[PDB]
Scaffold this active site. Structure first.
Site, PDB file in Angstrom:
ATOM      1  N   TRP A   1       0.826  -1.200   0.000  1.00 54.69           N
ATOM      2  CA  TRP A   1       0.000   0.000   0.000  1.00 54.69           C
ATOM      3  C   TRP A   1       0.859   1.248   0.000  1.00 54.69           C
ATOM      4  O   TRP A   1       0.537   2.229  -0.676  1.00 54.69           O
ATOM      5  CB  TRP A   1      -0.928   0.010   1.209  1.00 54.69           C
ATOM      6  CG  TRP A   1      -1.702   1.266   1.349  1.00 54.69           C
ATOM      7  CD1 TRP A   1      -2.883   1.557   0.758  1.00 54.69           C
ATOM      8  CD2 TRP A   1      -1.363   2.402   2.147  1.00 54.69           C
ATOM      9  NE1 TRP A   1      -3.304   2.806   1.127  1.00 54.69           N
ATOM     10  CE2 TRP A   1      -2.384   3.344   1.984  1.00 54.69           C
ATOM     11  CE3 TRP A   1      -0.297   2.712   2.981  1.00 54.69           C
ATOM     12  CZ2 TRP A   1      -2.369   4.574   2.621  1.00 54.69           C
ATOM     13  CZ3 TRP A   1      -0.286   3.933   3.611  1.00 54.69           C
ATOM     14  CH2 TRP A   1      -1.312   4.848   3.428  1.00 54.69           C
ATOM     15  N   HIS A   2       1.960   1.233   0.749  1.00 60.65           N
ATOM     16  CA  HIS A   2       2.817   2.413   0.767  1.00 60.65           C
ATOM     17  C   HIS A   2       3.395   2.730  -0.605  1.00 60.65           C
ATOM     18  O   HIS A   2       3.731   3.888  -0.869  1.00 60.65           O
ATOM     19  CB  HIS A   2       3.939   2.234   1.785  1.00 60.65           C
ATOM     20  CG  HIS A   2       3.628   2.812   3.126  1.00 60.65           C
ATOM     21  ND1 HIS A   2       3.693   2.074   4.285  1.00 60.65           N
ATOM     22  CD2 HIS A   2       3.256   4.059   3.494  1.00 60.65           C
ATOM     23  CE1 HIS A   2       3.370   2.840   5.309  1.00 60.65           C
ATOM     24  NE2 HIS A   2       3.100   4.050   4.856  1.00 60.65           N
ATOM     25  N   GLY A   3       3.493   1.739  -1.488  1.00 54.52           N
ATOM     26  CA  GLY A   3       4.038   1.935  -2.818  1.00 54.52           C
ATOM     27  C   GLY A   3       4.909   0.769  -3.230  1.00 54.52           C
ATOM     28  O   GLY A   3       5.861   0.431  -2.530  1.00 54.52           O
TER      29      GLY A   3
END
Ligand SMILES: CCCCCCCCCCCCO[C@@H]1O[C@H](CO)[C@@H](O[C@H]2O[C@H](CO)[C@@H](O)[C@H](O)[C@H]2O)[C@H](O)[C@H]1O
Lengths: 419, 79, 417, 79, 419, 79, 419, 79
Positions: E339-341
Site C-alpha cells: 500500500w505504501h508503494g
C-alpha cells in the site's frame, strides 16, 4: 546642550484622525472594552484615559510633531488658570476678577490667532485643535461665574477638555451637560440605539468625507480656481463655480468629520451635540444659523450673544430694543469672524453675516407688524406657499454661498494681489 | 412677600399689554412674548431684587412659562 | 546553513523596549485573560506564549545563550529533584548546602568568569541573575519542609515565568503556586485589569519618556564634561550622579511596572518592586522601598537565616555585633550578586555601613528618648525640620551610592580595573 | 512542660523585665519586641522546644500576640 | 473540439491543505456557521457540503491540477460499484461476488501504485489522497458483507468518503463510527470540550509542522543526506544521523497533519480517529503498532489481519496456532508495504516489520512459558526493574528507526542497487 | 439446542484444562486465553451453530465476556 | 486637472455582476450583517442603500462608464412620470392619461431598442439593465391604473426599482408582492430555510454558469461556429451542432445568473420570482413558457397578454374565442421579441414562438374535440402511454432548440441577409 | 330585475349548457370551464354590472370557488 528632543517627537508614529478607513478598525478594537463594560453599567475611567491619550498623541504627531510640546504646555496653563478661579469663587464673586480669569484662559487662542498677522509665522502655542479647546475651558469658567458649577475633580476636567473624539475640530460641549451624560450610564436599549446610530454615522461619514468631499475638493476645486485666476476681473463664471463647489466641499468635509466624532463619542457612551442638520434647506438666515455648525453657533448664542445683550440692556444705553439686538448680532458675528482667524476675509465674513442677520430680523419684524395690521383690519395676511418658500430657500442659499466665497479666502487671490 | 403681583404690574409698564387676567394662557400662541422678549424681563429681576438668573443653559424649554419664572426666583436665592 | 547563525536569523524583540512590543503582548495575552475570567486555565497556550516570548527576547546578536539557557534549566532539574527525592529520607544539614551550592553554581560561574581572565562564561544568558533566585528559594523551602510535593509542570512554569524572566520581580514558589492554582473573583479581576492598564501607562511615562530624557539627552554630555574636566571631584560629577540615579530609578520602575502589568494580565500578582523610594526618611526605610522584591528576598533568606545561624552557635556575645555583621554580610552578598568588580562591592559595603550606622543612630535615639521620659524631658519633636533633614541626607547618600554603583568612578578615577 | 508556663519563665529568665503583669498590652511600644529583637526570642524558644520553625513563612503579623505563638507551637507539635 | 480543458482548471487558486497559517483563518471563518449550528442541535448539511467542496478543490488544484478530473472520475467509479454491491446484498450473498466487488472497488489504488513500476510515469487516475480514500469505500463494502450496514443515502456516502479534513492523508475512518458521530449532535459541554481540544490541536500542529518539522527536514536532513552519500560504503555515521533525523521529521510532520485534521474535524463536530499517541516511548513492537499511525494500523488489524486469521483457521491449513499468527502478521505487513508503494524499499520495510512482530511474539511466548515454569518451581519471577523497561524502549526505538531508514528510500540512493 | 452445553463442553477441551468451575472470571487477567486467541472460539461455534460473528467492528470490547458470548447466539437468533 | 469626468468614471473599479467567484466572496462579506439582522425584526435602511449603490456603480463602470450618467437621468425620468400619474390617479383615471404615462415611462427603453436599428450605433440612454428596469416602472403605472396600489413613499419606490441583486438582468418583479414581502420579515426557521436555499442556489449556479456554461460556450461553440461558417450552404450538420451547443449554453448561463440573483435576494431577505424550473421537459410548447424564463413569461402573460384579451373581447371586435386567443398570442410573443431587440432574427424568434403556441392551442383543442367525438361514438380515446409523452417532449425540445438557433443570430451570419 | 336570479342566469347566458346544477362542484373535474374558458364568464359580467376587477394580479387562487366570487363582487359593488 542641543535640545533635539523635538526631532525625537517626529520619530513617533503618525495617524490622521478619521483620515483613513483602517483607522476605524483600530478605534473599534480599542473601544470594544469600553463599550462592553458600559453595557454592564461599568466605567473603567483608566482604560478610557489610555485610549484617549494614545489616539490624541497619534493624531498630533504629524509633520509638525513639535505641537505636542505646546499641548503639554496648554493643558498646564488651563489648569493653572481654572483652579485659580474656583478657589476664588468660594470666597468672592467680583466681576473684574472673572474677566481677568477669562482673558488669561483665552490668551493662548489670542496668541495663536494674532501672532501670524503681526509676526508672520505660526506661533509656538498652536497645535491641531486649540481653537476647539479654549471653548470648553472658558465654558467652565463661565459656569463657575454663574454659580451653576461647584467643586469637581481634576479627573472630570481633564477627561472633559481633552475628550478624544471631539478634539481636533469637533462638536463643542459644555461642562454640565457632558458631566451629567458621563455619570448616568444609559440603559441596554439606549446603548443598542447608540450603537446602531453610531454605525449609521460611520457609514455616512465614509460617504461624506472619503467620496463626496474628495470628489468636490480634489477634482473640481483646483481647476475652477485656476480658471478663475486666469480669467481675472472682479467677477466671472469660474469664480461663481468655485464658490459653489467650495461651499459644498466645506459642508461635506465638515459634516463627515462631525458624524465621525458623533459616532466615536456614542461608542464611548456620550452623545455630543450635533453639528449639521440640513443646512441648505434653511429658507431663512436665522433658520440657517440654527442649522449650520450647530454647536458653535449655539455656543456663541448661549455665552457671547445672550450675555452681551443682557449687559447692554442692564445699562439701557440704547433707546430702543431693535438697536440693541442689531448691535449684539454684529458684535457676536464679528467675534465669530475673529475666532476663525484675524485676516481681512474672515472679518469680512463675520461682519457680512452680522449685517445679513440684522437685515433678516428687520424684515421679519416688518412682516410681523404688517400681518398684525392686516389682522386688525381683518384682511387676510400675505400667502405662504410653495413659490414663497422656494424664493426664500433660493435667496438664503445664494447669500450663504456668497458668504462662503468670502470665507474661502479665494477672493483674496482672485481680486487682490497681482496674479 | 408675594412676587406674582410685582411681575404682573411690571410687565405692562413696558409691554403695554394687559396681563392681569391672561396669565395661564400660553404666551407663545398669544404673541405677547417673542422668545427673546423675556430678556427684557430678566433685567427687571436685577432692577430691584439684585439677583441674576443664570443664562448659561437658558433655552426655550425650562423657563418658557411665566409660572416657571415666578417659581424659580424663590429657589435661585437659596441654592 | 544550520548553526548559531540560524538562531541569530530569528526575530529579536527587546523585552519591553517599544510600545509595539506591548500591542503584540496584549494581543497574545487577551485569550488567556478572558479564559481566566471564567475560572479556567489553558496551560498549553500559556506554555507556548511564554516560550515564544522568551526565545524572541533571547534570539539577539548573541543567541548562543539560548543553548546555554537550556543547559541551565536541565542543570537545575538534575539537582532540584535530586534534593526532593532526598528530602523524604532525612535532612543532613550538609546535603542542603551542597545542593544550594550546585544550584547557584551557574550564577557564581557567570559572576566570576568575567573577572578572572577576560570574558563571561558560555552558560550566561539574559535573566540568569533573576532566575537562580527562584531555584534557591525552592531549595530553601525544601530544607525548611514548607514545601513537600510538586509536579514538573508547576516547577518549570514557576521558574521560567515569562513576565518576570528577563529581570522582573523575584518571587517564591509557595506564594506563586498558591496564587496560580486559585483563580481570583470577577470584581477582583476587574480591579487587577484596571491596575494593569494604570501600570502600563505609568511605565510608558517612566521608561519611554522620563528615562529617555534622563539617560539619552542629559547623561552623555554631562559624562563627557566630567571626563574632560578630570580631577577628584567636580560639579559635573554631581550632575552625572543625580542624572544617572534618576535614570536608573525611572528605568527600573518602568520595567517593573511593565512586568507587573503583564503578570496581572496573566492573572498572577507578582510582588511590587518600587514604592516611591525617595521619600525614605532613614536608610533602613529605603530598603523597604527600593527594589523591594530583591531586598525582601535578601532579608528573608540571607539575613534572617544568617543571624539565626550566628545565634545558634552563640558566636557573638551581644545582639548589636550580630546585627551589624549580618547587615554587612547581607549587603556585601547583594553587591556580589550585582557583579564582582570594585565598584559593585563598594556600593554593597557602603549600603551596609549606612545601614549599620542608621541602626546605631536609632538605638541612640531610643536610649536618649527613654532618658528624657525618665527625667520628664520632652522627646525630640519631628514635624517639619527633622523629617526634612532626614529625607535630604538619606536621598543624598542614596544618590552617592548610585554614583558609585554607576561605575562612573571607573572613568573619573584611574584605579586599576 | 506547659507551653504557657514555659513562655512565662522564658520571658523573665534573662531580661527580668517584670512583664508578667504586662501581657495584654502592646509589647511593640514597650521596647521588648522590635523588628530585630523578635528573632532573639524565636531562637531562645528554639532552645526549649527544639523545633526548627520556618523563617521564610514567618510573616510580620504571624506572631503579633503571645496567644498566636502559644496556639501555633501546639498546632505544629501535633503535625 | 480541442481538449484545452486542462489549462482551464489550472490557474484557479491553489490554497494548500494546512499550508500557510493564514489558511486556518479562512477555514476558521468558513466553519463559524456550522459550529454555531452544532450548538443549537441543527445540522446545515448543505453549507458544510459547499465548504468541503471549496476546500477540497482549493487543495487539489495545484501544479498537477489535472488530478481534479481524475477525482471526478474516481468518485463516480465508487458510486458505480458500491451501490451495485448493495443491490446484490438485497438479493443474495456469496463470497466470490464480494471478492470481485472489492477488487473492482480498490482497482484505482492498484493502478496508481503499480503503473510507475511498469510504465515509469504516474498513472492518470491519481490525485492527492487516493491512497487514503479507497479505504473508506472498501470499508463500506466490507461492512455490507457482514450485514452491519444495510441502508444509506448518497448524501451520507459522499459526505463520508470525501470528508474534507481527513482527505489528503488523514485519519482513516469507518462508516459506522462516522455515521453515528454525525447523526447525534453533541451537547453544549461536549461541544465546548471539543472546541478547546481543537484549539489545542491547532497550536500543537503549528509547533509540530511549522517549527519542528521545518527544523528537522529543511535544515538538518539535506546536508546529512549529502554527507552520507559522499562518504559511501555500506554504513557510516552520517547515514545513521540521517536515519534518526528523518525518523523524527517524519513523525513530526505526520503528527502535525493529524492534529490539524483532528482539530478541523472537531470544529465540524466529528471526532476523527487519533493517529499518534506517544509512539517513541513504546517498549515493544506490538506495543509500538498501537501507537504509531493508529488509524491505519487499527484498520489493517480490523479488516486485513483479523479476517486473514479467520479464513486461515476456518480451513485449519496449519496444525498450530503460532504458525497461523506468524503467517497472518507477515501477510498483513507485506500488504501494508505494498500500500505504501510497490518498490523494493517499501516491500523491504513491510517484510522487516512483519519479521519483527513475529520475533516479538515468539519472545513473548518464551517469556510467558519461562515465567510459568519459574512460578511452578517456586522461584521468583523475571525482573520488572526500570532497567528492563529502559532496555526495551531503547531496542524498540532503534529497530523502529532502522525501519524508517529503509522506508525513507535513502537506501536506494546510498546503495546504487536498482533491483 | 443449548449454547451453554456446547460452551462448557468446548471450554474444557480447547485448552485441555478443566476450568469449567470458573466462567465469570476476567480472562484479561486470568491468562487462560490470550487477546488474539479468541478467534479460536469464533470459528468453533461456526462448526456448531453455523453462524459467523462479525469482526468488522467488534474489537476488544463487544463480546469480551463469556456470558455475552453465550447469549450472542440467542440475540442473533431474533435477527 | 481631471480632464473629462468620464475618465474619472472609467478609472473606478469595475466588477462584472456575478463574474469571478471572488465577487461572491465580496458580496457575502458585504451582506452578512443584513442577513444576521434579518433574524430579528429590524433592518438597516442606510446600510442596504449604501451596499446597493456601491455594487450598482461597481457593475456599471468600466469601458462603458458613461452609461451610469444615463442611469441618473433615467431615474429622474421615471420619478417625473410616476408621481405625476400618482397625483392624477388620486383624482381621476382616464384611459388616455394612463396610455400617455405608460408610453412616457417606457420611452427610454423604446429609444434604446429603436436607435441602433435606425442609422445609428448606440443610444446614450442605454445602460446595463434598462431592459429589466422599465418593467418595474410600467408595472407601477399599470398597478395605479388598476387601482390596486394607492400610496407609497419614495424610499419604497426607489428601493424596489433599483434592487441591487436584480438590476443587471434578473427576475422581473411586480411591486405589490415585493413591497408586501419587504414590509414583513419572515420567521427564524423560514430564514434558515432561505439560507439553505441560497447556499444551494450558489452551488448550483457555480455548476451552471462557471463550468457547464464554460464547457458549452467557450470550448465547443467557437469551433462549431467556424465549421458552419466555412461550410456554408442553407443548412448543415455544423449548423445543427451549433444550434444545440448554443441553446444549452444560453440556458446554462441564464440559469446561473438567475440562481445567483435568487441566492443574493434570499440573503437580503426577499424571495424574488424563480426564472427556470426544469425547462426542456415540457410536453407541449405551452408548458415551456411556464418553465422558461418564468418571471418574464408570467409578466407578459399577466400585464400584456391578459389585458390584450380583455380589451379585444370587451370591444367585441372579433366573433369567436379562438381568433381572439390567436391574435393575443401572436401580439404577445411579437412584443417579447421586440423587447429583446429590433432586428430580423429577434422578431423571427418571437413570431415563431407565437406560431408554435397558437398551433399548440389548435392541436390541443382538436385533440379534445376528437376525444369527445370518440367517447360519444364509443371509440377509445387516444392512449397516453410513455411513447406519446416521449415523442411530445422530443418535438418540443427540438422546436425550442430551433428557436434558440434563430434567436442566437447565427442565421444572420450564415444567410448574410438583412445586412 | 332580480340580482340573485341574475347571478344564476349569468353562467347560462353565455355557454347555454345549463350548468346551474354544477355550481359548487369542481369545474376542472367536469371540464366545462378551464383556465381559458372561465375568462369569458369573468369578462361577461363587466359589461353588465360595470366592475373593473383587477386582472393584473389575478392568480389561480381567487376564483377557484364559485361561492367566494359572488360575495366578493357583492362586497366590492359599493366599495
Ligand atoms: C528485527 C527483529 C527484531 C525486531 C525487534 C524485536 C523487539 C522485541 C524483542 C525484544 C524484546 C525485549 O523487550 C522486552 O519485551 C518484554 C516482553 O518480553 C516487554 O514486556 C512487556 O510485554 C508486553 C508489552 O506489550 C506486556 O506483556 C507487558 O507490558 C510486558 O510484559 C518489555 O517491556 C521489553 O523490555
Amino acid at each position: 546642550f542641543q535640545g533635539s528632543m523635538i526631532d525625537f517627537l517626529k520619530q513617533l508614529p503618525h495617524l490622521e484622525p478619521y483620515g483613513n478607513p483602517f483607522y476605524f478598525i483600530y478605534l473599534g478594537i480599542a473601544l470594544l472594552p469600553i463599550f462592553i463594560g458600559l453595557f454592564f453599567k461599568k466605567r473603567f475611567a483608566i482604560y478610557e484615559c489610555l485610549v484617549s491619550i494614545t489616539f490624541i498623541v497619534l493624531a498630533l504627531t504629524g509633520t509638525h510633531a513639535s505641537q505636542i510640546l505646546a499641548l503639554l504646555f496648554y493643558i498646564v496653563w488651563q489648569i493653572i488658570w481654572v483652579y485659580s478661579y474656583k478657589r476664588y469663587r468660594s470666597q468672592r464673586d467680583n466681576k473684574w476678577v472673572f474677566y481677568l480669569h477669562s482673558f488669561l484662559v483665552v490668551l493662548p487662542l489670542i496668541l495663536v490667532k494674532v501672532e501670524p498677522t503681526i509676526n508672520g509665522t505660526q506661533s509656538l502655542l498652536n497645535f491641531l485643535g486649540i481653537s476647539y479647546l479654549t471653548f470648553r475651558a472658558v465654558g467652565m469658567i463661565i459656569e463657575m461665574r454663574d454659580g451653576v458649577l461647584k467643586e469637581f475633580t481634576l479627573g472630570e476636567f481633564l477627561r472633559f477638555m481633552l475628550f478624544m473624539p471631539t478634539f481636533t475640530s469637533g462638536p463643542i460641549d459644555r461642562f454640565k451637560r457632558f458631566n451629567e451624560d458621563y455619570q448616568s450610564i444609559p440603559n441596554r436599549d439606549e446603548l443598542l440605539n447608540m450603537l446602531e446610530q453610531a454605525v449609521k454615522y460611520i457609514m455616512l461619514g465614509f460617504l461624506y468625507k472619503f467620496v463626496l468631499a474628495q470628489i468636490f475638493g480634489s477634482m473640481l476645486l483646483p481647476p475652477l480656481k485656476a480658471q478663475a485666476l486666469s480669467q481675472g476681473g472682479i467677477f466671472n463664471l469660474p469664480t461663481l463655480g468655485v464658490m459653489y463647489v467650495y461651499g459644498f466641499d466645506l459642508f461635506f468635509d465638515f459634516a463627515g468629520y462631525s458624524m465621525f466624532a458623533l459616532a466615536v463619542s456614542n461608542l464611548m457612551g456620550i452623545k455630543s451635540p450635533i453639528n449639521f442638520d440640513k443646512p441648505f434647506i434653511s429658507r431663512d438666515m436665522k433658520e440657517f444659523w440654527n442649522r449650520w455648525h450647530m454647536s458653535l453657533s449655539f455656543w456663541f448664542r448661549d455665552f457671547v450673544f445672550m450675555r452681551l445683550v443682557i449687559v447692554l440692556m442692564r445699562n439701557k444705553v440704547f433707546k430702543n430694543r431693535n438697536t440693541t439686538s442689531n448691535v449684539a448680532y454684529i458684535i457676536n458675528m464679528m467675534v465669530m469672524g475673529f475666532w476663525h482667524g484675524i485676516t481681512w476675509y474672515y472679518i469680512a465674513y463675520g461682519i457680512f453675516h452680522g449685517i445679513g442677520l440684522v437685515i433678516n430680523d428687520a424684515w421679519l419684524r416688518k412682516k410681523k407688524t404688517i400681518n398684525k395690521d392686516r389682522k386688525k383690519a381683518g384682511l387676510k395676511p400675505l400667502p405662504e406657499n410653495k413659490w414663497t418658500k422656494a424664493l426664500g430657500i433660493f435667496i438664503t442659499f445664494n447669500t450663504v454661498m456668497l458668504s462662503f466665497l468670502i470665507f474661502s479666502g479665494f477672493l483674496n487671490d482672485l481680486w487682490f494681489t497681482k496674479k | 412677600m408675594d412676587v406674582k403681583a410685582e411681575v404682573i404690574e411690571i410687565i405692562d409698564e413696558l409691554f403695554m399689554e394687559d396681563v392681569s387676567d391672561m396669565m395661564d394662557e400660553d404666551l407663545f400662541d398669544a404673541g405677547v412674548l417673542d422668545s427673546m422678549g423675556t430678556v427684557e424681563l430678566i433685567v427687571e429681576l436685577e432692577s430691584r431684587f439684585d439677583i441674576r438668573v443664570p443664562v448659561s443653559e437658558f433655552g426655550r424649554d425650562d423657563w418658557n412659562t411665566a409660572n416657571k419664572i415666578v417659581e424659580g426666583v424663590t429657589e435661585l436665592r437659596n441654592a
